[PDB]
Design a binder for this molecule. Structure first.
Ligand SMILES: CCCCCCCCCCCCCCCC(=O)O
Length: 276
């Protein structure tokens, strides 16, 4: 088979170990503070942790921006020079960011073949189809076949993004959408859909799993990526609760990056779900 590089953007919150394990690179989007300071959303443990403290203490909530066309071109040329034959890019929902269009535009100006997939998802749900793509490629599947299957998986809603936030004001401030209240959301057709408000994390956790249950019977086989915005204990509880009604053949936790955290706010907990 040919050598295929897989690239997701930083809003995919890819598990750190997956970069090497599945040869998945991550392109940084940016966080720009009101004072003009700009910083890349790199998948580095300590850097993300440092960002959590800073956004929690900041006097304002920063804005975010897609990678530049130049940023994408740079990556594509780098992979060509690393002898890759093709580049498979999976971006977050085109309805949530201009990242998809930027990746597509850049793909037109470079020599190496670049296929861009609008996942219509965000955060931890994105690395799921990315890994499925690598597994299929490794077994000799062609790009055309991979794109075909992913399209089917999407049609059957096999990849889900369900989560809840602690302070809804972050999402409102971001533009994409009381005491102890928790707002539960899920991504549908690439858009953020608030579907419930509850009190406390236990109920929020239960509501996330209830939402999953609407089309995925308990006992179903899954692969999961639990995500959190500086609330590891919170997502651990979520996955522990999930294991009691489903057959989780694989799970891993990944911290939400600077860009996702800027929009959802600290305290957020949720999971990317792949229905096997
Ligand atoms: C896996 C479950 C968690 C899902 C979390 C979804 C969070 C969505 C928040 C909106 C992010 C918008 C990013 C805009 C980036 C840009 O500036 O172009």
């Amino acid at each position: 088979h040919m050598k295929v590089k897989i690239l997701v953007d930083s809003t995919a919150d890819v598990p750190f170990s997956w970069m090497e394990k599945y040869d998945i690179d991550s392109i940084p989007l940016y966080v720009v503070w009101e004072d003009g300071r700009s910083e890349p959303d790199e998948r580095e443990p300590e850097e993300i942790m440092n960002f959590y403290k800073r956004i929690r203490e900041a006097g304002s909530v920063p804005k975010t921006s897609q990678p530049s066309v130049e940023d994408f071109k740079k990556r594509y040329l780098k992979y060509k020079e690393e002898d890759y034959d093709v580049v498979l890019v999976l971006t977050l929902s085109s309805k949530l960011s201009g990242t998809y269009n930027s990746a597509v535009l850049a793909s037109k100006e470079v020599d190496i073949p670049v296929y861009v997939v609008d996942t219509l998802l965000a955060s931890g749900a994105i690395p799921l189809p990315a890994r499925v793509a690598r597994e299929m490629l490794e077994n000799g599947a062609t790009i055309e076949e991979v794109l075909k299957k992913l399209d089917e998986r999407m049609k059957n809603k096999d990849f889900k993004a369900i989560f809840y936030v602690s302070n809804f004001d972050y999402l409102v401030k971001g533009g994409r959408v009381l005491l102890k209240i928790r707002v539960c959301l899920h991504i549908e057709n690439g858009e953020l859909i608030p579907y419930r408000k509850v009190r406390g994390d236990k109920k929020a956790i239960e509501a996330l799993i209830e939402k999953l249950r609407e089309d995925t019977p308990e006992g179903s086989k899954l692969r999961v990526i639990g995500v959190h915005a500086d609330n590891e204990a919170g997502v651990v509880e979520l996955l522990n609760t999930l294991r009691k009604s489903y057959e989780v053949v694989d799970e891993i936790i990944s911290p939400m990056g600077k860009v996702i955290t800027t929009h959802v706010g600290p305290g957020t907990v949720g999971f990317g779900i792949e229905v096997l």
